[PDB]
Structure 1
């Protein structure tokens, strides 16, 4: 249908970037509805690599208008920084990127805070990405955060900032005994790029309304994944926003009833970056082989990712939360060369109970062990294959099983980082 949503069904890094970019070929708009620059998507066109963080992954297409919705936490600094890098490479960012005046602003102190909280947590740290995503979402919700629209009347912006900065420094200094952030440098750096920002402002919410009434193919691009959902995720080891399909309406302004199809990006195995429950986590050679073979390092912090088997119990939670319509199975090629492959099909609770449902809150996952279901592998190569035909039978089978255990069709299978190393069985846009 017209409005297609692409999100991460696991713990982010499933392959949203590539997939957004591959499917945008047909779309007018691309909307990031949540997160900030903690995200790190990764598009590879004809072997040329672009890793986007805060800018929508539809940015490399002149025929698509990239929008950053009000749900997103906007860092003026990082935006300018990514902007220039894309511009140096001939991608006229400023020309194809629009933004919301409702977007909260991430400023230096937000990072100051994040660093503090995390240190305070001492040994039980969330393992956040370092930006000030959390604190920015808090200030937002606390109704003291600064938003893009505030950048307009600059005299008052300066009153507001001095005020908020005064607040956060007291804590930083007196409480965390950390060094305060200077109000002047914050004000200056922000003001130096204000005009750039305010320039891209548009009423995204009303924009999506007409795009829709016309029939425009729009694509929502999600950051992070389901189990990182501030609400439904492995709290408190989560991100401070709704990464689940409901952040679409709340993070863009589009009426919820206008989501037509929801595509879940599903990685073929599991990876996690940050502290948190991970039932199917591996610490053996196959664990190493997965990270190694799938170049599993964060596209934003550099951190090695925790690898594990594909958890069907957890993904099935994704199906229901996101109202999935289909799955895009990614990184299949990474499994090539494995003798056999396993997918967690049920959870063994700490008290002997066998369940096919997931707990909800880090703690409530404290002793769960997974009940796999071993499948034979395939030594054949699936890399860049563009057709089921080239996929070996084991593969076809491992894939069919996933459909059975979830009741969700795998509409897209990806055989490589390259925009073109993919098979599209059913295009979300024409369904």
Structure 2
């Protein structure tokens, strides 16, 4: 009646939890796989039959030639990067993707100078406070800021009267040079490429509202929504201001695709068995030591977009439970359990104490978070190779206890356990 309900895959920590993996797995029989917020600052790794892919703007289901990939109005798109990405995956075998890629005509555009201002703002904050955000420098913040200001431009603007567009492009370019006089912008040059992309994107563009709506009310379809970033990186709920500039939480699905809450079915939270954070900001369970090195190393924890080394720490339940209050997860996907195969003991943060007393809830003030003392619980390691596990029974005793521990302390059920990078390295628990 009201229509089909989409399935959502969201990050529950600070990203890189394995969203590409979970989405790839669920997109096998999906009719539509979509992306709702963020840009190519996102980096999702998919592994199927040896071949490894790293998607940024392309929905991770772009591999499925039977499914339709959709980029929603909440996404911010840098045209050059978009094709740079598609062509790189073409070389990996991706063919006729422009045949199954639809782009919402309301999605905003990330311009060359946006990524430029992004870098400049980072160097300015660093060379003025010794500390900056840790941005991926993909111009995400500047573009979302132009959007809220209503000065930004969108897909439909590029595909319309080009002369009109150009007049706006120039005004926006200037507006930036104003706040950053040391910014160089080849107005006429960048516009030449944008005119070229216009005709390259044209055939794929569609009205997103009508598109999603038609799909959710026509003959039942299986629609999958790929989140980007994660709960604690959410512009509203994350460790502000050390967050990304979009809503990575479940609400972002509605505002980013134009679908009402009743068309939202299962909302899966991707939970990494340990915590990682790439960029600046508070991180309670962070491990700057041998154990931190072993997680970073055994987990190959480096940017799939920037190449930066990620910070690593024990699992942290304070952020997870917080993420659950905002997203209302219906089941979890616990990834990279195998990374813990070697440990004799695995610590997990259960609460935060301040001045001796335990704090009641996750702090809105990030600076506070930088001073909390994490209260840990120590669990026994299983000291066994789980990379070959395929069913609940395979996992040794301690591994199973660790899975329950996450379950119980979150009140949410674990539906999948990740034991490898490839699609097959999964254990559906129900």
**For residue 195 of structure 2, what is the aligned residue in structure 1?**
191
**For residue 185 of structure 2, what is the aligned residue in structure 1?**
181
**For residue 34 of structure 1, what is the aligned residue in structure 2?**
37
- The Cα of 1:184 is off from its aligned counterpart by 1.0
**For residue 394 of structure 1, what is the aligned residue in structure 2?**
398
**For residue 161 of structure 1, what is the aligned residue in structure 2?**
169
**For residue 284 of structure 2, what is the aligned residue in structure 1?**
279
- The Cα of 1:356 is off from its aligned counterpart by 5.3
- Find out whether 1:82 has 2:117 as its counterpart: no
- Find out whether 1:305 has 2:344 as its counterpart: no
**For residue 68 of structure 2, what is the aligned residue in structure 1?**
65
Q: In the TM superposition, what whole-angstrom CA distance separates every residue of 1:131-187 from its partner, at most 9, and x where no partner exists?
A: 1000000001100101111012211111111111122123221xxxx2321111110
Tell me whether 118-127 or 208-217 shows the greater mean CA deviation. 208-217
- Residue of structure 1 aligned with 2:385, choices 373, 381, 387: 381
- Find out whether 1:372 has 2:385 as its counterpart: no
- The Cα of 1:87 is off from its aligned counterpart by 2.6
- Find out whether 1:137 has 2:140 as its counterpart: no
DSSP-derived class of the 1:62 partner = coil
- The Cα of 1:124 is off from its aligned counterpart by 1.7
- Find out whether 1:49 has 2:52 as its counterpart: yes
For 2:393 and 2:95, the matched residues in 1 are separated by 36
Q: In the TM superposition, what whole-angstrom CA distance separates every residue of 1:371-397 from its partner, at most 9, and x where no partner exists?
A: 011000011110141111111100100
Tell me whether 25-34 or 201-210 shows the greater mean CA deviation. 201-210
For 2:79 and 2:280, the matched residues in 1 are separated by 28
**For residue 412 of structure 1, what is the aligned residue in structure 2?**
416
For 2:189 and 2:368, the matched residues in 1 are separated by 44
Q: In the TM superposition, what whole-angstrom CA distance separates every residue of 1:87-125 from its partner, at most 9, and x where no partner exists?
A: 332332201110011111011110121112111212120
**For residue 300 of structure 2, what is the aligned residue in structure 1?**
295
**For residue 324 of structure 2, what is the aligned residue in structure 1?**
319
Kept in 2, the 8 Å contact 1:336–1:377? The answer is: yes
- Residue of structure 2 aligned with 1:263, choices 242, 265, 268: 268
For 2:338 and 2:17, the matched residues in 1 are separated by 13
- Find out whether 1:25 has 2:55 as its counterpart: no
- Find out whether 1:108 has 2:116 as its counterpart: no
Kept in 1, the 8 Å contact 2:283–2:370? The answer is: no
Q: In the TM superposition, what whole-angstrom CA distance separates every residue of 1:52-73 from its partner, at most 9, and x where no partner exists?
A: 0111000000111000000000
- The Cα of 1:78 is off from its aligned counterpart by 0.6
DSSP-derived class of the 1:345 partner = strand
DSSP-derived class of the 2:102 partner = strand
* Structure 1 stretches lacking a partner, 5+ long: 427-431
**For residue 117 of structure 1, what is the aligned residue in structure 2?**
121
Matches within 5 A, 1:185-224: 185-213=189-217, 214-224=219-229
* Structure 2 stretches lacking a partner, 5+ long: none
- The Cα of 1:6 is off from its aligned counterpart by 0.1
For 1:294 and 1:355, the matched residues in 2 are separated by 31
DSSP-derived class of the 1:290 partner = helix
Q: In the TM superposition, what whole-angstrom CA distance separates every residue of 1:283-313 from its partner, at most 9, and x where no partner exists?
A: 1211100000000001000000000000011
For 1:317 and 1:257, the matched residues in 2 are separated by 23
- Find out whether 1:252 has 2:260 as its counterpart: no
Kept in 2, the 8 Å contact 1:313–1:356? The answer is: no
For 2:28 and 2:296, the matched residues in 1 are separated by 30
Kept in 1, the 8 Å contact 2:106–2:208? The answer is: no
**For residue 429 of structure 1, what is the aligned residue in structure 2?**
none
For 1:404 and 1:383, the matched residues in 2 are separated by 24
**For residue 180 of structure 2, what is the aligned residue in structure 1?**
172
- The Cα of 1:365 is off from its aligned counterpart by 1.1
For 2:360 and 2:271, the matched residues in 1 are separated by 18
- Post-superposition, which runs of at least 4 consecutive aligned residues in structure 1 deviate over 3 A? none
TM-score by length of 2: 0.96
TM-score by length of 1: 0.96
Q: In the TM superposition, what whole-angstrom CA distance separates every residue of 1:183-203 from its partner, at most 9, and x where no partner exists?
A: 111101111111111221112
DSSP-derived class of the 1:411 partner = strand
